[PDB]
């Protein structure tokens, strides 16, 4: 059940990791694209407590929540359907499985480079079973101008 419209102007994402540069780039792209809401709803970092990160919305200061668990991030933001997994090559697999255990996540973009091919094939099999679209376990992202931008794709503004 893979969808055809991966990104909409109402798309929101959950970034897995302290990648504040990438999230700031996404917010800058959102603002310059005349979007009404940020495309990053929450960030998940398992190594720190739940707090709020201060980011830019053009000129304004906004607060993006940072969660320690993926579960509470998923519950507090039920309309999020994209996960951008910034985990390393030795932590992307289990994180991607745990994400795919949530039905609301329709696409996962894995940025890590160097995942072993057996684990990648397991990821492919379970994503096909769950109908999730994994955009590339070695990528930089996919950019849909005016709509969405995955991580660092395109560069700075």
């Amino acid at each position: 059940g893979k969808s055809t419209t991966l990104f909409s102007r109402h798309t929101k994402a959950i970034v897995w990791g302290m990648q504040t540069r990438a999230v700031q780039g996404m917010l800058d792209f959102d603002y310059v694209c005349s979007r009404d809401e940020p495309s990053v709803a929450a960030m998940v970092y398992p190594f720190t407590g739940d707090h709020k990160q201060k980011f830019y919305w053009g000129h304004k200061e906004i607060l993006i929540p940072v969660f320690k668990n993926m579960a509470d991030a998923m519950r507090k933001h039920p309309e999020v359907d994209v996960l951008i997994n910034f985990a390393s090559l030795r932590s992307a697999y289990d994180s991607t499985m745990e994400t795919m255990n949530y039905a609301q996540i329709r696409t996962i973009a894995i940025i890590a480079e160097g995942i072993p091919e057996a684990l990648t094939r397991k990821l492919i099999k379970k994503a096909d079973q769950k109908g999730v679209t994994i955009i590339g376990p070695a990528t930089v992202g996919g950019i849909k101008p005016g709509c969405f931008k995955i991580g660092n794709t395109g560069g700075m503004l």
Binding site: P46, F47, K54, K68
Partner: protein, 273 residues
């Protein structure tokens, strides 16, 4: 008068065992000040006498001095030196400025010494191999204290972790805990190359190793001095040099009251409470 001839008893509080001011000479542990200076033990020796109440071997004294020197200062941007500079720049006395900077030394700033030693000691005493300790810390959602540098990673050493490590290798007799910490460092640098031992972690592990590896400690004293906070004491005593240096600097440069810029605050007050 009634106590001089001893017809009365009063209970004495304040048991003390680190100094005897009374009598002919100052006595630190049991060894008079003249013997302290005649045996040529330095500041490390008097930390051995006052803190641990023991006449430590020469390499232990020199290592204590070394770890005081590496700790002395790490620039003015760090939180404690910031407080010392702010208070010195407000016209306060040396004691108030050093005190206001010292009051920051806690768990988040300056707490890596004792935390890294406690963590590595609890790992090593429970018989976990390094590869399982790294995975346990990852599983628990906790970072390893004493491991991790911002920039200086590989063929780019801390250059003062190197000095301390060389001293520990050439002079300490046995380093069961430093070797364990270095294996954990090898694993974490396999992960990411800037996850090397801190100076804050190497001093902790090498001090625990010195306590339980040299003589005069029974591993029930060595494991108690870590719990009490002797490593917090070493960080505070070492960084007092840098904080007083910052006070003297800001007071010699003749700089006036600091008021924070309003554009670096971002007031977020409620609407109308």
């Amino acid at each position: 008068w009634a106590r001089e001839l001893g017809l009365i008893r009063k209970p004495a509080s304040f048991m003390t065992s680190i100094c005897d001011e009374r009598g002919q000479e100052l006595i630190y542990a049991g060894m008079p000040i003249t013997e302290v200076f005649k045996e040529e033990m330095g500041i490390g020796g008097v930390l051995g006498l006052l803190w641990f109440q023991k006449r430590l071997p020469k390499y232990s004294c020199q290592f204590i001095e070394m770890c005081l020197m590496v700790t002395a200062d790490h620039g003015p941007a760090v939180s404690g030196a910031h407080n010392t500079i702010i208070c010195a720049r407000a016209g306060k006395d040396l004691v108030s400025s050093l005190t206001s900077g010292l009051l920051t030394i806690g768990d988040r700033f300056g707490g890596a010494l004792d935390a890294a030693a406690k963590m590595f000691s609890k790992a090593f005493d429970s018989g976990i191999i390094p590869m399982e300790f790294v995975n346990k810390m990852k599983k628990e959602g906790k970072l390893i204290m004493g491991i991790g540098h911002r920039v200086k990673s590989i063929n780019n050493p801390d250059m003062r972790v190197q000095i301390l490590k060389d001293y520990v290798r050439q002079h300490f007799p046995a380093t069961p805990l430093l070797d364990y910490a270095l294996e954990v460092e090898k694993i974490t640098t396999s992960k990411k190359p800037n996850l090397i031992l801190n100076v804050d972690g190497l001093i902790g592990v090498a001090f625990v190793d010195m306590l339980r590896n040299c003589g005069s400690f029974t591993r029930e004293e060595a494991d108690e001095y870590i719990d009490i906070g002797a490593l917090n004491g070493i960080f505070v005593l070492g960084r007092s040099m840098g904080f007083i240096g910052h006070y003297l600097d800001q007071k010699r440069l003749k700089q006036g009251l600091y008021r924070h810029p309003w554009d670096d605050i971002s007031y977020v007050l409620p609407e109308h409470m």
